[PDB]
Point group: D2
Chain length 241, copies 4
Amino acid sequence: MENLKKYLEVAKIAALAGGQVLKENFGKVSYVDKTSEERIKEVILKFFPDHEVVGESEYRWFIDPLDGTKNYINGFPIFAVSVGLVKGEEPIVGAVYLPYFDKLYWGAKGLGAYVNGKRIKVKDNESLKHAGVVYGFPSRSRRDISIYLNIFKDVFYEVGSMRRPGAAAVDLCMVAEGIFDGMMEFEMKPWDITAGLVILKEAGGVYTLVGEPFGVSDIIAGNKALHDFILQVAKKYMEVA
Amino acid sequence: MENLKKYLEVAKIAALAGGQVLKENFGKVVSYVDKTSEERIKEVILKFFPDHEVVGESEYRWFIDPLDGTKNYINGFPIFAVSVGLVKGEEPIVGAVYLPYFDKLYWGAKGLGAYVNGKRIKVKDNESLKHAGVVYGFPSSRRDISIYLNIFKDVFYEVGSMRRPGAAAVDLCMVAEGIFDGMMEFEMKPWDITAGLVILKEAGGVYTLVGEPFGVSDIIAGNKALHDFILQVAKKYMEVA
Amino acid sequence: NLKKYLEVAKIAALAGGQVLKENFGKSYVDKTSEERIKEVILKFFPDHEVVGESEYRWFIDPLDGTKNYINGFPIFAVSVGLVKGEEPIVGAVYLPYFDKLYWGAKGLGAYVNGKRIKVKDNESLKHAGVVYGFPSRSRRDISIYLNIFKDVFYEVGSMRRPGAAAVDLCMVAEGIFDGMMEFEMKPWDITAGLVILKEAGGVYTLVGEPFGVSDIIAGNKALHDFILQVAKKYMEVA
Amino acid sequence: NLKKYLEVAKIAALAGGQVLKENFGKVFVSYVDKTSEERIKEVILKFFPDHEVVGESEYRWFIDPLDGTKNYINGFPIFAVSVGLVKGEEPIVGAVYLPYFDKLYWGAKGLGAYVNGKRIKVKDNESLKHAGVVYGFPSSRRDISIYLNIFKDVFYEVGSMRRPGAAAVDLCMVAEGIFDGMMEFEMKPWDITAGLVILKEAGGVYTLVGEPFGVSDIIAGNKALHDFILQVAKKYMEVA
């Protein structure tokens, strides 16, 4: 933690470096996915050769060169680059950049959560009918779809509104910014969420990780209210330990 | 209707009138906004055409949506719009939809084409389902939710991706713009889709309206491929006539 | 009908600005623009008069920054101002590229997209920023403007020539620039901007014939007094 | 190795631009400038430890942490970060970032000039009366008159003349085809080196009067305007 602030500024530059690849290529197009990754990898390693990078010790950078690929290929502006860092098992730094909006979300353990310099935080709201929730799950799941459909139906009925933007890292950043009350994505990878979670926690959010935090996981995050409720419902059709 | 041109130009201005209310109030944590936007629109339309009828909540009928995507707008999510559509008798002839946050004005008129801020648009060519992008939306409902979950899962298994942005007028413009192959909206009002529908049609899109075009309806629109696919699936779980 | 003239001015500017927006990066524009502006105005106030290249006059610039617009420089706007008798009371200046709408009305304050604005404070002249402008083929001798330019140049921190008076007035109003100096002006290029600047707590002096060819010196008290100080040394005033 | 120098350059500009970006509007200055400078110099030296950084060997980087300082402090969006690479005495790499507009101009010798992954080129001109020129000079080492005379003669011939207040950005707008040319006096290497590479690869022409790596005056634009505003200059200050 002696160079936490140096890790942060490096995470931010890495996200921007790969975010520029997404920027220059938007609307023109998978070579982008690899070019963004190389750039991110280059920045991290030149600064910290010894660290390990994961995607696709005591310092593991979990990166997502392009979160929201399908949206990116179709032209839907909800996509980003995610750059998270974890010491041992503890996630300590997060950087998520939204190229199309030129919005850079970031945060470090105990240092706060920000978006382009402005401090952010999850919103205050108990009321479920006044709440907004984003969600997401795969098309060819490892788990039966019906389960996800049943969980959806239950929250959908109590919540004020639900949205499926198509990019976990962004969903995580909008919850941390106080736009959406909570989220719930299933069958996630560490690089999909690591950076976003750090930011969410620093913005004062709560979250339950189901499964191996660095393997395949499920995530239920948001303010106190939605987290407990999405979690309650989430365990009627599946198991949590 | 020799004034199509004038009708179009008025629709656009009116959408800009209401959109201005939506943009300068965005972010300011009661929906006096919606009422004010509506007031500006009705006002513009009725100074140019005093005898035309304006619908939303007698040969020419203007269907207007002062605020498509209320939930998103309140929460701080960019996907919201204002729609202004003109119907002569029964035929939709002019459409204008404005995305204030993006300062994007989608417009079109019968036989004159579809446009977005000056550039001509059109639906995409692809007929491959696994590559297709689809947007959907059903309310939280008049009919049993199971029906929507059933139509969703099926399409979900075939298409490349599915999104729920939360504002039908925008879903229609993005389909018209060729970002999404198709859209799927259930239990709509005429002022939710009339404008976006004119636009979609001029972009070369195909669509199926279920129920009374000027009463509660369901809309399935997109390129040929997706419209044929979504419609066929829907017909397995619900009635269309 | 005070709050009503303002809403119409805003919609009129937006209407004309939309034309500029659709064609940016390509006079049909200028013509089409004023066409939309006068049309919206006369639809809401058939008794009012429109002017712009009856106790209620609207001075409009369908496209301020024509040259910038043609080159692809983002500095350009639409200007819609209203005068009652001889007093500027309502103004709207829209900048299509930045999607920023500046508006104001006597007693109601100045705004830019729903945000209230005000001119800036100045303690040191060498910290001030000034925007200026004069024509290439001018009625006055360029020597006069060069003298005015130097004197002001040596005293302030910076001087900029953006190319759109209507936009210069607005930037002084928002407190980006301490003040401006624009010479050989027409009423439709500055009326809407003046209303906005004054409601932003600004000061200004018109030289010549308002609603005619004039000069304009505007900004916070400090720069206005200084720019006017210099001007008086090389030319006519009152 | 040009390709690797260019990618690094873009990143360096972006990094320093981020500082400028998250501090724009917040009425300090030395802090932003210095913080931006430190981030740019760090990235460069990280990929090329042997290179030399300059501004305020066989491979020198001329960087401007914040071009358009006064504009930046005032809140006028015309400002940027300039990162240029020089091999020997020749400008070979250039990256100019405009944080506010989120536009990144870039180029490398023999590779072309771009803006956010968009190939750019100077505009074609015929009539001087249709030309647009950006100018600028310090408040100076030469008698203002000299510059005012040059400005005056050009002013009389072209359609328009603007003074945005940021050389780096100026050179990029000429490269993009917005302005036909620009004249700027009393320049430093870090102010124009990046823009120069970008301009030249956009098919532009420029003349450096003075010491390229010292204090200099720059005449740059397409062929037309460059020749024209070069004629006028040597009519008042006698370029070599």
